[PDB]
Design a protein around this ligand. Structure first.
Ligand SMILES: O=C(CCCC[C@H]1CCSS1)NCCCS(=O)(=O)O
Ligand SMILES: [Ca+2]
Ligand SMILES: [Ca+2]
Ligand SMILES: [Ca+2]
Ligand SMILES: [Zn+2]
Ligand SMILES: [Zn+2]
Length: 158
């Protein structure tokens, strides 16, 4: 499938969930990109205006693509693989309650998984992988990519 053919990738946070402090949104997303830049040649920079490669949106229900959200629960987020326009973009369901910890749905973990899609990864069958389809909280300091995630991403980049 598609991959980014350049090393400098930009992101932009389109809007912010009212679920969290702004600074904590910024931090979660930044740390989630770092997970991936740690194991690839990629570099990620946040921009505040203009077209970014990866636009980070919080939205509910029908939100302008063919991938409507479903209210609280179920689908938490989705992202598009590498490509121009909507390609790369990561969308998070505002009907979830996003958090820094275990209380609702952890933004960091979810963002790691979505950014993996944004980079070109599909789902893993390994329950230990961040690219496994099902959300399960793990302490956000205990978190590591699985071997399977690392193989997947390095098979695409690096
Ligand atoms: O695929 C996703 C992103 C969530 C990944 C969360 C990470 C937790 C640690 S590793 S995966 N959302 C839709 C399916 C979720 S749901 O069906 O389980 O409610
Ligand atoms: Ca894009
Ligand atoms: Ca949902
Ligand atoms: Ca919310
Ligand atoms: Zn969407
Ligand atoms: Zn997924």
């Amino acid at each position: 499938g598609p991959v980014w053919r350049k090393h400098y990738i930009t992101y932009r946070i389109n809007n912010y969930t009212p679920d969290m402090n702004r600074e904590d949104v910024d931090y979660a997303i930044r740390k989630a990109f770092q997970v991936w830049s740690n194991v690839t040649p990629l570099k990620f920079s946040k921009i505040n205006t203009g077209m970014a490669d990866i636009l980070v949106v919080f939205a509910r229900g029908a939100h302008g693509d063919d991938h409507a959200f479903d209210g609280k629960g179920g689908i938490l987020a989705h992202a598009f693989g590498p490509g121009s326009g909507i390609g790369g973009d990561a969308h998070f369901d505002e009907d979830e309650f996003w958090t820094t910890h275990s209380g609702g749905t952890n933004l960091f973990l979810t963002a790691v998984h979505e950014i993996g899609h944004s980079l070109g990864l599909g789902h893993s069958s390994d329950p230990k992988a961040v690219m496994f389809p099902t959300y399960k909280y793990v302490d956000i300091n205990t978190f590591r990519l699985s071997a399977d995630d690392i193989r997947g991403i390095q098979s695409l980049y690096g």
